[PDB]
Amino acid sequence: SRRKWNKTGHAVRAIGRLSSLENVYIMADKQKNGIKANFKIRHNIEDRGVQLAYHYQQNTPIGDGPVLLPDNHYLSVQSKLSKDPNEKRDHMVLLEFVTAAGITLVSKGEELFTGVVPILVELDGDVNGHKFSVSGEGEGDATYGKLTLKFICTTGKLPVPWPTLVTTLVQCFSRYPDHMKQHDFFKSAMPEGYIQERTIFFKDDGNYKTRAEVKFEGDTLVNRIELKGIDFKEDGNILGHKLEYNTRDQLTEEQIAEFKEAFSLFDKDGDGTITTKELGTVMRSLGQNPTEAELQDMINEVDADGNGTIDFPEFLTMMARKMKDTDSEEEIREAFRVFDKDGNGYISAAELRHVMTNLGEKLTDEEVDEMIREADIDGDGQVNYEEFVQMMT
């Protein structure tokens, strides 16, 4: 049928994911007696395209009491942005889940986070001289890494898109699994708290410099932030409000079933989890040729439970996130070059066969030709970049 495109499409999408770095990477910073962090955020642009935001982060304790300095690991975020239909003001309702991972198979401040903690957020900002203030409130549940908050823009209309402020607007609320509790800097510095500093680069546009104090005041965890933006284009995605607000949907029974079909290409023994050896097989037959260390690495990107293998659920989660976010054109080109083997700019009937045969799928010519026939918008008997993009959505 045509669901041969979706299958192998998603299989290339998956290797795309396992090759990139989408998490919050955290490292010791001994000099500053703290941590450093870096990560990339993808903001969907209205209709097509992505606006990427590269983050650099630094945290320093406010007090003198000993702190935990972690081995490298990451946080994994799931954000949901919504509207309060009763809210007249410019606002953002936020639901967020955050888990630590990245290390395969316990401080005094960790005690302060065992129940539900109230949160207050206070931001003053200035982007290209357009000043604004955001006020926020809600709760945090470190037990499940859960955050629920509502933010009001107290100065009227917010001059930047709400999504762009999510990372600035309390990582002490992340769930650290049992085996990684010695690595939780954030809770370790409570109640006195930390300074959190960031520079955020919006590609082809300006940057935010942020500084925040995160500490307890009485029984509330408070985040007080100042933000400065410069070099922004007034017609760009930020100042021009061209960024999608709504967290793209949930998942069809139809979509889940497609991700399962891809999953089975990797899970060749049908045991419900993907090994390094299984990942390798698919990649070699796809032309690439990675080391045992890379495979451990790619798997570690998505290995929620740290067992060294991608479990079926872990795989769904991974795919759900990869479908919610848009790939950059660089990334889509790489997906193309997997097919366009000679690199002429076009996927030939012959090239498409070569790939499928290798993926473990014998298919007749009318079969192959039909796939080609399906994607062929103009009708040159091949698939070019523009045709490919439209058939990878």
**Residues binding Ca ion (CB under 5 A):** 267, 269, 271, 303, 305, 307, 311, 314, 340, 342, 344, 346, 348, 376, 378, 380, 382
Between strands 220-230 and 273-274, the pairing is unpaired
Q: Is 331 annotated as a binding residue?
A: no
Nearest residue to the partner Ca ion, using Cβ: 380
Nearer residue to Ca ion within complex by CB, 199 or 344: 344
What lies within 8 Å, CB to CB, of 217 at 6+ separation is 120
Burial of 266 (0-12, 13-18, 19+ CB in 10 A): buried
CB of 219 to Ca ion, least distance (A): 37
Nearer residue to Ca ion within complex by CB, 114 or 264: 264
Distance between start and end Cα atoms, the chain: 17
| Secondary structure tally for the chain: helices H, strands E | 10, 15
Q: Is 273 annotated as a binding residue?
A: yes
- Cα dihedral sign, 339-341-344-349: negative
CB of 235 to Ca ion, least distance (A): 34
Nearer residue to Ca ion within complex by CB, 71 or 305: 305
Q: Is 340 annotated as a binding residue?
A: yes
Quickly list DSSP for 3-66. Answer: HHHHHHHHHHHHHHHHHS--SEEEEEETTTTEEEEEEEEEEEBSSS-EEEEEEEEEEEESS-S-
Nearer residue to Ca ion within complex by CB, 177 or 236: 177
Taking the CA of residue 216 as centre, how many other CA atoms within 13 Å lie in the half-sphere pointing to its CB?
Answer: 17
CB of 37 to Ca ion, least distance (A): 23
CB of 214 to Ca ion, least distance (A): 31
Structure tokens at 351: 């090239």
Q: Is 305 annotated as a binding residue?
A: yes
Q: What is the rounded distance in angstroms from the CA atom of residue 332 to the CA atom of residue 392?
A: 9
Q: Is 376 annotated as a binding residue?
A: yes
CB of 178 to Ca ion, least distance (A): 15
Q: Is 344 annotated as a binding residue?
A: yes
Nearer residue to Ca ion within complex by CB, 296 or 348: 348
Per the annotation, binding residues for Ca(2+) are: 267, 269, 271, 273, 278, 303, 305, 307, 309, 314, 340, 342, 344, 346, 351, 376, 378, 380, 382, 387
